[PDB]
C-alpha cells in the first residue's frame, strides 16, 4: 500500500514567536514556530491585518528560537534550536522570499534527547555569543563574530557541562559591552538520587547561576551560583548598561523576584490575585510568558498569568540599583504561548490554543483608576494583593488569526446538502472551544445588493481617468438595453454623463487616458472626455476584445476588424480585415505593459473548436502565430501574467491553463455549466475568476497557483471593482440581481464558520436521520454550572460574614459580576474535579437544540447514537461517564453509562436510565443491534434492557485499558491504550467475544479507522500513523476453551494472540493525530485517508494508482532529500522514521518543495528525473488535484 | 564499552529496577518537553496551561519514581 | 583509540595513502559528511594532521554514508590517538 502524504491545511498552532527586522528594514516582522513549520509574519501597521510572507516545513521539531543582531548590523538573524542536534542560523532573504542557512554547526545525535542541547536557546543581547543548553548536564556556547565581508562567522563550541544538573530556563544577561553572561535556573539532582529517605529531594533548592564567557581566554566560567527561596519557572532579561540596571527577573510560584550579582539586594513582589476568584485556593499562580518593551528613555515588561491576566512590570532604580518592582494590571487576553510587543505599538498574542490576536496598544498602562502594586508595600506571608479583572482598556483588537489548534475530533460529511462534504471539526480547549465547519473556498462579504429588472446579461466597471484610484461607472447590459450607474456617494442611476445607447453592449472600457469606448452589436461608440462607427453592411459585431490602447472586434462570418489608438487620441482602423476558418465565439487581449505601447498576442476562439494566437505588431499584423485544437467549443479566453498564461474555458465545464512562453497545458473539469473568465484584482495582483456551477478563483501565490471556489451561489457575470466603500471588490450579476461583493479573508484553503462550545469537546456523533450532532464536552479542573453557582453563593455569604452594609452591597455586586469564561478563563477547580455536558447541536447554524448537564465530577469520555433490536425504530444516545477520575496517579470511583431516548426528530434527549460500571466506559460502539462498551480492559456487549443495560457477553483477555472500538461484520477492532490493535470476533450463536489476532508492536493509539475488512489505519500519541493488515489466510473462526485448555496448554505467540497483523505502512506525521477518516474530499475525486492534528493541521494520505506515479515520486523524494535538505539540519528520512522506519509513504510536503527551489536546483533535479521542471511541477499538481482540492 | 559512560541513561549488569526506571521517566519528561504536540495533548487532558505542564514536568525530574530502593 | 572531545570548526584532513577512507570504518565507499576535528587536534604541528595516521593531509577527511546514517559523525572529534 504505497501512499503519498499531502498537507491541505498547515498547522496553525504557535509554540514560539520572535520579533525583529528580519528583512533588514525599518519595519518589524515576527517569526513563529508551529513545531514542524517555520513561518514569517508581517503585521501591517496601517491595515492591522497580519500577512504570512513565507511558510517552510522544516521536517524537524523546533524547540527554541531566538532573534539576534551583530553589533552595528541592520538586520536580525534567526538562530534555531531543534531535535536535529545541529545549531542552525538563518537569514531571511527578502528578495528571494526564502530563509537562507548562514551556519549549521553540529554537536550531537538527533531526537528530543535529555542530555543533547537544543531545548533551551539563549543569545547575548549584543549578539556576541549564543548558548544552546540541554535540559540536563550539557550546555554549549558558540561565539559569534562579523567578518570583513560582513558575513556571519560562528566560533567552535565551548563546553559548559555540569553533571546531575537540570536546567529550567537560560537567558542571556545584558552586561553591555562587558564579557557575555548567561543566567540559568538549575537544580542539582545528585543527592536526591543517593538518599533513601527522600529528604534530599525535599531540601534540594534551585539555584540561579551566572555563567560568564571570558571572550579573551575562550572559556566559560560558572562565576556565581545562588539558592532561590522558591522554584522559578522562567527568567526575563532586564535591559543593561545605559538602557537599564541589568540583572534578571525570576518568575516563580506566586512571586516575581529581581536579582543581580554584586551589591544588589533581592527585591520580591507577590503576583496580585483576582478579587473574588472562584479558583481552587490550593492553586499557586505562575507567569506563563513575557514580552519586553525597550524604549529610548524607559523599559517595561508584560507578563501574563495562567488566567490570561497581563501585568505591566516596571523597575524603580536609585543609581544602578533596583529598589522596587511595580506591577500594574494591564489587560486580560487568552492564555499565550508567546507575546511580542512591536515597535509600531502593537501586541501580538500567540494563543496557547485557538485563534491568535493582534492588538493595538491604545494606552501604555499609565492610568490611575486601577492601583499599582509594589515590592515596597507592607504585606504578610500567605496574604496577597488583589486586583479586579475588567474589559479591555489598554488594548484594542485589530486582527484575529483563525486557528484550528487543537483538533480533537473530526467528521467529513455533507450535512448541508451541498455538492461537496464539509469538515465538522471539534476545536479549542475550555470556554474557547468551538465546533467549526470547514468548506473548501473563500469567505465572501456582500457589500451591497440591488435587484435589477428584466434579465441582465453583462456588467463592467470603468474609471473616469487612468490616475483615478477608484472606479466611476458600473454598466449593466440587458437583453434590449444597457444601463449606467455612477458610483458616487449614493450609487444613483445616471443618464447624461454616459451616452452609450438603447442597444445591448458587448464591452465598456477606458481606452484613452480619459476616453471611454463602448462596443455594441451595431457598432462602436467613442466618447472623448462622440465618434460613431457603424457596422459594415448588414453584419453585426459578434464578439470583442478591448485594451488600454487596442480594440479588436469579430463580426458575423468571422471577420476581424482591428482598431489602434494613436498618441493623439483617436482610433485608426487597420487597412486589412482577416476572415477566420469559422465564426468567432470568444476573444481575449492581454493588457499592455506600463512601458510598451501595445500588446502583441490576441487569442481568438472559433466554432472550429480551436483557439488561435494572432500577432498585433505592425510587422506581422493579423498573421497566424500558433493554433490549437480543443476537446469542445470554447466559451471564454483570458490572457494573464502569472510568465504568460492563456486560460481557456470551454462550453463543457472544462478549463485549461496554457503557457505561451514558447506551450504545454493542464486542464480540469469545474462541469454542468459553461466556463466564463473574468479579470479580477486580488491582493494587488492580477487574478482570474472562472465561473461555472461555482465561482472559482485562480491566483498565483509565491510562484504557486491556487484554484479556490467561492462559498457563494451561482453567478452570471462579474468585473473588477474598486471604490472608497470597497477598495478591492467584484461587481457580479446573477439572475435578476446585482451584487457588490468582496473577498477579504482567504482563510487559507478552508473558510471557517465557528459555533461556541462550553468545555473541551471530546467526541461527537451525527444522528443519521435529522443530521444533528450529539457532542460531549468535558474538562478536568472544572466546575459544572450548579457547582459554579453554589461556590458563588457561599463566597457571597462568607464575604458578608467577614462594614456589613458595604459588605452586603459588594456581595450583591459579586453575585451579578459575571465575566465571560471565554475572555477571563473558566475558573480552575481542584485536581480530580470535572465538568461535562451533552449538547445536541444543528450543524447548519450552531444553535444548541438541547443541553444535558451531568453531575459534578462526572466526565463524559464516550458517546454513541444507535437503534436496538428490541426497540426497533426508537433511537438512543449512550454516553459513557467516569466518576471522580484522578488522572495522575490514576484512580477512579468507577463509571456510568447514561442512556437517553432520542426524540423530537433527534432534537431532544429524554433520559431513560443510568447504569453503573466498574471502571471508565472509554469507548462505545453499536454492534449488530446491541451496544459494545469497553470498560477498562473489559470488552462487553450490552442489550438496552428497560431499567438498565444487560451484559450479554464480556471479554477479559484485553491486555490493558481500551481507548477505541471499530466494527465491521462480526469483526471488532479494539484500540488498547499501549498494546495497539486487537482483532476480536463475535461468535453470534455461542455468545463469545474471541481474540483472534494482535499487532507485534506497542503503539500508544489515539484513533483508528477501517480501510477494509482486513486493514486498520491507526495513529498514536507520538505523532505517527501506521497501517496494519491481517495477513492472507488469517482465520477469524477461532474457539475459546470451556474448561480452560486455551489459557493453559493451547496458547498465543510471544505472550500475545496466535495470529499477528503485518505493519504495511509507517510514517511520522511530525505531530499528534486524533482523527482518521477514509473519504472523498471533492465530487468525483478519488478517495483518500484524511487526518487532523493537535497543532490544527489537516492532511491526506492518498494511494498511488500505479508505478508510473509511485516510482516517479520515489525518485523525486530521493533527489530532494539530498538537493533540498531540511532547513533546521534534520535528516528527512530520519524525521519520517522517528519511532519506526518509514514504510510505503512518500512525503509530498517535501516533493512540493521542488516548486520553491531556485531554478538552478530545479534544472539539476529535473535532469536526474529525465524531465523538464514544468513537467515535474505538473505531475505534482496532477496528484494533488486528483484527491485534494 | 567504557565510552558509553559519556552518555547518561546507559546501564550495565548491576543496574537495578530503580536506576533503569528513573532514566526511563527522566528521558520521557525531556521528550514531552521537546515534542510540542505531546505537550499539547497533556495540557488539553489536564485542562492546564502549557507553561504549568512544563513546570510540573521539570518538578517531576528530581525524584520521578520516589526515593531509591534503600 | 579515538579522541572524542567536542568537535569544532576545523575540518579533518587525510594523507594520500589514506585518501578517501572513512576514519571510523575504513571503507572507501560513498564519502558523505565532512569530518570535523577539535581545535586541540588541529593546533600548530597538529594542524594539517591526517585523521587516521597523523601524516600531512592532502585532502579533506569524509565520514561514509553508512556512518552518517548511524549518527557516527556525532560522537566527537575522530582523530585517532
Ligand atoms: Zn564509515
Ligand atoms: Zn580531537
Ligand atoms: Zn594517513
DSSP-derived secondary structure for A914-954: EEEESS-EEEEEEETTEEEEEETTEEEEEE--SSS-EEEEE
Question: Is there a contact between C7 and A140 if contact means CB atoms under 8 Å apart?
Answer: no
- Which helix or strand (DSSP H or E) is residue A816 part of? helix A804-816
Question: Is there a contact between B38 and A1023 if contact means CB atoms under 8 Å apart?
Answer: yes
* Residue A45 burial (CB count, 10 A): 15
Residue A658's contacts (CB-CB under 8 Å, 6 or more residues apart) are: A628, A645, A646, A647, A648, A664, A665
> Would an 8 Å CB–CB cutoff place C8 in contact with chain A?
yes
A900 and A852 in contact (C-beta within 8 Å)? yes
Phi and psi torsions of A796, nearest 5°: -70, -45
Question: Is there a contact between A156 and C39 if contact means CB atoms under 8 Å apart?
Answer: yes
Q: How far apart are CA A879 and CA A895, in angstroms?
A: 11
Q: How far apart are CA A74 and CA B67, in angstroms?
A: 54
Q: How far apart are CA B33 and CA A133, in angstroms?
A: 13
Q: Which of A106, A117, A160 to mutate to test the interface with C (most CBs of C within 10 A)?
A: A106
Task: Provide DSSP, A738-803.
Answer: EEEEE-----TTEEEEEEE-SS-EEEEEE-TTT--EEEEEEEES---HHHHHHHHHHHHHHHHT--
Domain ranges of chain B: 1-70
CA of C55 to the centre of ligand 3 (A): 5
Distance between start and end Cα atoms, chain B: 28
The partner residues of A976 in beta bridges, in order of sequence, read A962
Task: Provide DSSP, A45-102.
Answer: TTT--EEEEEEEE-SS-EEEEEEE--TT-SSPEEEEEETTSEEEEEEEETTTTEEEEE
CB burial of residue A592 (10 Å; 0-12, 13-18, 19+): middle
CA of C9 to the centre of ligand 2 (A): 12
Best CATH choice for the domain A3-401 from the list 3.40.630.30, 3.90.79.10, 2.40.50.100, 2.130.10.10: 2.130.10.10
Of A1158, A1146, A1151, A1147, nearest to A1180 (Cα)? A1151
Phi and psi torsions of A1052, nearest 5°: -95, -175
Cα→Cα distances A203→A444, A749, A887, B23, B61, Å: 62, 55, 27, 22, 15
For chain A, positions 83-102, list CB contacts with chain B under 8 A: 83
Q: How far apart are CA A867 and CA A875, in angstroms?
A: 5
Binding-site residue positions of C: 3, 15, 18, 22, 25, 38, 41, 50, 53, 64, 67, 77
Question: Is there a contact between A157 and C6 if contact means CB atoms under 8 Å apart?
Answer: yes
Residue C80 DSSP symbol: B
Binding-site residue positions of C for Zn(2+): 3, 15, 18, 22, 25, 38, 41, 50, 53, 64, 67, 77
Write down the residue that cell numbers 552595528 correspond to.
Answer: A72
- The topology (CATH level 3) of A445-753 is Methylamine Dehydrogenase; Chain H (2.130.10)
The cell numbers describing A144, all together, are 559569534
Q: State which approach was used to obtain the coordinates.
A: cryo-EM
Task: Write down which chains contact chain A via at least 3 CB pairs under 8 A.
Answer: B, C
A474 and A463 in contact (C-beta within 8 Å)? no
Q: How far is it between the farthest Cα atoms of chain C?
A: 33
Q: Beta strand pairing status for A634-641 and A644-650?
A: antiparallel
Q: How far apart are CA A237 and CA A174, in angstroms?
A: 7
Phi and psi torsions of C46, nearest 5°: -65, -30
Rg of the Cα atoms in chain B: 15
CA of C6 to the centre of ligand 2 (A): 7
Question: Is there a contact between A106 and C7 if contact means CB atoms under 8 Å apart?
Answer: yes
* Ramachandran assignment for A545, one of left (phi > 0), alpha (psi -120 to 50 degrees), beta (any other): beta
CA of C22 to the centre of ligand 2 (A): 16
Kindly report the nearest CA distance between residue C24 and chain A, in angstroms. 16
- Which helix or strand (DSSP H or E) is residue B45 part of? helix B36-46
* Ramachandran assignment for A523, one of left (phi > 0), alpha (psi -120 to 50 degrees), beta (any other): left
> Would an 8 Å CB–CB cutoff place B65 in contact with chain A?
no
Residue A696's contacts (CB-CB under 8 Å, 6 or more residues apart) are: A670, A689, A690, A707, A708, A709, A710
Question: Is there a contact between A35 and B26 if contact means CB atoms under 8 Å apart?
Answer: no
Q: At what angle do helices A1173-1187 and A1107-1123 cross, to 10 degrees?
A: 120
Residue B28 DSSP symbol: H
Cα→Cα distances A1025→A57, A260, A1134, C17, Å: 18, 49, 15, 48
CA closest to A116 among chain C residues:
C74
Question: Is there a contact between A109 and C8 if contact means CB atoms under 8 Å apart?
Answer: no
Of A1076, A1127, A1133, nearest to A1099 (Cα)? A1076
The beta-carbon neighbor of C71 closest among A109, A154, A156 is A109
**What is the interface size between A and B, counted as CB pairs within 8 Å?**
142
> Would an 8 Å CB–CB cutoff place C71 in contact with chain A?
yes
* Residue C80 burial (CB count, 10 A): 15
Q: How far apart are CA A76 and CA A20, in angstroms?
A: 6
Report the residue count for chain C: 81
Which of helix, strand or coil describes residue A515? coil
Question: Is there a contact between B37 and A1094 if contact means CB atoms under 8 Å apart?
Answer: yes
Q: How far apart are CA A258 and CA A255, in angstroms?
A: 10
Report the residue count for chain B: 70
* Residue B66 burial (CB count, 10 A): 10
Q: How far apart are CA A549 and CA A565, in angstroms?
A: 5
A438 and A422 in contact (C-beta within 8 Å)? yes
The cell numbers describing C8, all together, are 569544532
Amino acid at each position: 500500500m504505497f501512499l503519498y502524504n499531502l498537507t491541505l491545511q498547515r498547522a496553525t498552532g504557535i509554540s514560539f514567536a520572535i520579533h525583529g527586522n528580519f528583512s533588514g528594514t525599518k519595519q518589524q516582522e515576527i517569526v513563529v514556530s508551529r513545531g514542524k513549520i517555520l513561518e514569517l509574519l508581517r503585521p501591517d501597521p496601517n491595515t492591522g491585518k497580519v500577512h504570512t510572507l513565507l511558510t517552510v516545513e522544516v521536517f524537524g521539531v523546533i524547540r527554541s528560537l531566538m532573534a539576534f543582531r551583530l553589533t552595528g548590523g541592520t538586520k536580525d538573524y534567526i538562530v534555531v534550536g531543534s531535535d536535529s542536534g545541529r545549531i542552525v542560523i538563518l537569514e531571511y532573504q527578502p528578495s528571494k522570499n526564502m530563509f537562507e542557512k548562514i551556519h549549521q554547526e553540529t554537536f550531537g545525535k538527533s531526537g528530543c534527547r535529555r542530555i543533547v542541547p537544543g531545548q533551551f536557546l539563549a543569545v547575548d543581547p549584543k549578539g556576541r555569543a549564543v548558548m544552546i543548553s540541554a535540559i540536563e548536564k550539557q550546555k554549549l556556547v558558540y561565539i559569534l563574530n562579523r567578518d570583513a565581508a560582513a558575513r556571519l562567522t560562528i566560533s567552535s563550541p565551548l563546553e559548559a557541562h555540569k553533571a546531575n544538573t537540570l536546567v529550567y530556563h537560560v537567558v542571556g544577561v545584558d552586561v553591555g559591552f562587558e564579557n557575555p553572561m548567561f543566567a540559568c535556573l538549575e537544580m542539582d539532582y545528585e543527592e536526591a538520587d543517593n538518599d533513601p529517605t527522600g529528604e534530599a529531594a525535599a531540601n534540594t533548592q534551585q539555584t540561579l547561576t551566572f555563567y560568564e564567557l571570558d571572550l579573551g581566554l575562550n572559556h566559560v566560567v560558572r562565576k556565581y551560583s545562588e539558592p532561590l527561596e522558591e522554584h522559578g519557572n522562567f527568567l526575563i532579561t532586564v535591559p543593561g548598561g545605559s538602557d537599564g540596571p541589568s540583572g534578571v527577573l525570576i518568575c516563580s510560584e506566586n512571586y516575581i523576584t529581581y536579582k543581580n550579582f554584586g551589591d544588589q539586594p533581592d527585591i520580591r513582589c507577590p503576583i496580585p490575585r483576582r478579587r473574588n476568584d472562584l479558583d481552587d485556593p490550593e492553586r499557586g499562580m505562575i507567569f506563563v510568558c513575557s514580552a519586553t518593551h525597550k524604549t529610548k528613555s524607559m523599559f517595561f515588561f508584560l507578563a501574563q498569568t495562567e488566567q490570561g491576566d497581563i501585568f505591566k512590570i516596571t523597575l524603580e532604580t536609585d543609581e544602578d540599583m533596583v529598589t522596587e518592582i511595580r506591577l500594574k494590571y494591564f489587560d486580560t487576553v487568552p492564555v499565550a504561548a508567546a507575546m511580542c510587543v512591536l515597535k509600531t505599538g502593537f501586541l501580538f498574542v500567540a494563543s496557547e490554543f485557538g485563534n491568535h490576536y493582534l492588538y493595538q496598544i491604545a494606552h501604555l498602562g499609565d492610568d490611575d483608576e486601577e492601583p499599582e502594586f509594589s515590592s515596597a508595600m507592607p504585606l504578610e506571608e500567605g496574604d496577597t494583593f488583589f486586583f479586579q479583572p475588567r474589559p479591555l482598556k489598554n488594548l484594542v483588537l485589530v486582527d484575529e488569526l483563525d486557528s484550528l489548534s487543537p483538533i480533537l475530533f473530526c467528521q467529513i460529511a455533507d450535512l448541508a446538502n451541498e455538492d461537496t462534504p464539509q469538515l465538522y471539526v471539534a476545536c479549542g480547549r475550555g470556554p474557547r472551544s468551538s465546533l467549526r465547519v470547514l468548506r473548501h473556498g473563500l469567505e465572501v462579504s456582500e457589500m451591497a445588493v440591488s435587484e435589477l429588472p428584466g434579465n441582465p446579461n453583462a456588467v463592467w466597471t470603468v474609471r473616469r481617468h487612468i490616475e483615478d484610484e477608484f472606479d466611476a461607472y458600473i454598466i449593466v447590459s440587458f437583453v434590449n438595453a444597457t444601463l449606467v450607474l455612477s458610483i458616487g456617494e449614493t450609487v444613483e442611476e445616471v443618464t447624461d454623463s454616459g451616452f452609450l445607447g438603447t442597444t445591448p453592449t458587448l464591452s465598456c472600457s477606458l481606452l484613452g487616458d480619459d476616453a471611454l469606448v463602448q462596443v455594441y452589436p451595431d457598432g462602436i461608440r467613442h466618447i472623448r472626455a462622440v465618434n460613431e462607427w457603424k457596422t459594415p453592411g448588414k453584419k453585426t459585431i459578434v464578439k470583442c476584445a478591448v485594451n488600454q490602447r487596442q480594440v479588436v472586434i469579430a463580426l458575423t462570418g468571422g471577420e476581424l476588424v482591428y482598431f489602434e489608438m494613436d498618441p493623439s487620441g483617436q482610433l485608426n482602423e487597420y487597412t486589412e480585415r482577416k476572415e477566420m476558418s469559422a465564426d468567432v465565439v470568444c476573444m481575449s487581449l492581454a493588457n499592455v505593459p506600463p512601458g510598451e505601447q501595445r500588446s502583441r498576442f490576441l487569442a481568438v476562439g472559433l466554432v472550429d473548436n480551436t483557439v488561435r494566437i494572432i500577432s498585433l505588431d505592425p510587422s506581422d499584423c493579423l498573421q497566424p502565430l500558433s493554433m490549437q485544437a480543443l476537446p469542445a467549443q470554447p466559451e471564454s479566453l483570458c490572457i494573464v501574467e502569472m510568465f504568460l498564461y492563456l486560460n481557456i474555458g470551454l462550453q463543457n465545464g472544462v478549463l485549461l491553463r496554457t503557457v505561451l512562453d514558447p506551450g504545454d497545458l493542464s486542464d480540469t473539469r469545474t462541469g454542468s455549466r459553461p466556463v466564463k473568465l473574468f479579470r479580477v484584482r486580488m491582493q494587488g495582483q492580477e487574478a482570474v475568476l472562472a465561473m461555472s456551477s461555482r465561482s472559482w478563483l485562480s491566483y498565483s501565490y509565491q510562484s504557486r497557483f491556487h484554484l479556490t471556489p467561492l462559498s457563494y451561489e451561482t453567478l452570471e457575470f462579474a468585473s473588477g471593482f474598486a471604490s472608497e466603500q470597497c477598495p478591492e471588490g467584484i461587481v457580479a450579476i446573477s439572475t435578476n440581481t446585482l451584487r457588490i461583493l468582496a473577498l477579504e479573508k482567504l482563510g487559507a484553503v478552508f473558510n471557517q464558520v465557528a459555533f461556541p462550545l462550553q468545555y473541551t469537546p471530546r467526541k461527537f456523533v451525527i444522528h443519521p436521520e435529522s443530521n444533528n450532532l450529539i457532542i460531549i464536552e468535558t474538562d478536568h479542573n472544572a466546575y459544572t454550572e450548579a457547582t459554579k453557582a453554589q461556590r458563588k453563593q457561599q463566597m457571597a455569604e462568607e464575604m458578608v460574614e467577614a462594614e456589613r452594609e458595604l459588605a452586603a452591597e459588594m456581595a450583591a455586586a459579586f453575585l451579578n459580576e459575571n465575566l465571560p469564561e471565554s475572555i477571563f478563563g473558566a475558573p480552575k477547580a481542584g485536581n480530580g474535579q470535572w465538568a461535562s455536558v451533552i449538547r445536541v447541536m444543528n450543524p447548519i447554524q450552531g444553535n444548541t437544540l438541547d443541553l444535558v448537564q451531568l453531575e459534578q465530577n462526572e466526565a463524559a469520555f464516550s458517546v454513541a447514537v444507535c437503534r436496538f433490536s428490541n426497540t426497533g425504530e426508537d433511537w438512543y444516545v449512550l454516553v459513557g461517564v467516569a466518576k471522580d477520575l484522578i488522572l495522575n496517579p490514576r484512580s477512579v470511583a468507577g463509571g456510568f453509562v447514561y442512556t437517553y431516548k432520542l426524540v423530537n426528530n433527534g432534537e431532544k434527549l429524554e433520559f431513560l436510565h443510568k447504569t453503573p460500571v466498574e471502571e471508565v466506559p472509554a469507548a462505545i460502539a453499536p454492534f449488530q443491534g446491541r451496544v459494545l462498551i469497553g470498560v477498562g480492559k473489559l470488552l462487553r456487549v450490552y442489550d438496552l434492557g428497560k431499567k438498565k443495560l444487560l451484559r450479554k457477553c464480556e471479554n477479559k483477555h484485553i491486555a490493558n485499558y481500551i481507548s477505541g472500538i471499530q466494527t465491521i461484520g462480526h469483526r471488532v477492532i479494539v484500540s488498547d491504550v499501549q498494546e495497539s490493535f486487537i482483532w476480536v470476533r463475535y461468535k453470534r450463536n455461542e455468545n463469545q467475544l474471541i481474540i483472534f489476532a494482535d499487532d507485534t508492536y506497542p503503539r500508544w493509539v489515539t484513533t483508528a479507522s477501517l480501510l477494509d475488512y482486513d486493514t486498520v489505519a491507526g495513529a498514536d500519541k507520538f505523532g505517527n500513523i501506521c497501517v496494519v493488515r491481517l495477513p492472507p489466510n488469517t482465520n477469524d473462526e477461532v474457539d475459546e476453551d470451556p474448561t480452560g485448555n486455551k489459557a493453559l496448554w493451547d496458547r498465543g505467540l510471544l505472550n500475545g494472540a496466535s495470529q499477528k497483523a503485518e505493519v504495511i505502512m509507517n510514517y511520522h506525521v511530525g505531530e499528534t493525530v486524533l482523527s482518521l477518516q477514509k473519504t472523498t474530499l471533492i465530487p468525483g475525486g478519488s478517495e483518500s485517508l484524511v487526518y487532523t492534528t493537535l497543532s490544527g493541521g489537516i492532511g491526506i494520505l492518498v494511494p498511488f494508482t500505479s508505478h508510473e506515479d509511485h516510482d516517479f515520486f520515489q525518485h523525486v523524494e530521493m533527489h530532494l532529500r539530498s538537493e533540498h535538505p531540511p532547513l533546521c539540519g534534520r535528516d528527512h528520512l530520519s524525521f519520517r522514521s522517528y519511532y519506526f522506519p518509514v514504510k510505503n509513504v512518500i512525503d509530498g510536503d517535501l516533493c512540493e518543495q521542488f516548486n520553491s527551489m531556485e531554478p538552478n536546483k530545479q534544472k539539476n533535479v529535473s535532469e536526474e528525473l529525465d524531465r523538464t521542471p514544468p513537467e515535474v511541477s505538473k505531475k505534482l499538481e496532477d496528484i494533488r488535484t486528483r484527491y485534494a482540492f | 564499552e567504557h565510552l558509553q559512560s559519556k552518555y547518561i541513561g546507559t546501564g550495565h549488569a548491576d543496574t537495578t529496577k530503580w536506576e533503569w526506571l528513573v532514566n526511563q521517566h527522566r528521558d520521557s519528561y525531556c521528550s514531552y518537553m521537546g515534542h510540542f504536540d505531546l505537550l499539547n495533548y497533556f495540557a488539553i487532558a489536564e485542562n492546564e496551561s502549557k507553561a504549568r505542564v512544563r513546570f510540573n514536568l521539570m518538578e517531576k525530574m528530581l525524584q520521578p519514581c520516589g526515593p531509591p530502593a534503600d | 583509540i579515538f579522541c572524542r572531545k567536542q568537535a569544532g570548526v576545523a575540518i579533518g584532513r587525510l594523507c594520500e595513502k589514506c585518501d578517501g577512507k572513512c576514519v571510523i570504518c575504513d571503507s572507501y565507499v560513498r564519502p558523505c559528511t565532512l569530518v570535523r576535528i577539535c581545535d586541540e587536534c588541529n593546533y600548530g604541528s597538529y594542524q594539517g594532521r591526517c585523521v587516521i595516521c597523523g601524516g600531512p593531509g592532502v585532502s579533506d577527511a569524509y565520514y561514509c554514508k553508512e556512518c552518517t546514517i548511524q549518527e557516527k559523525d556525532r560522537d566527537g572529534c575522530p582523530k585517532i590517538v
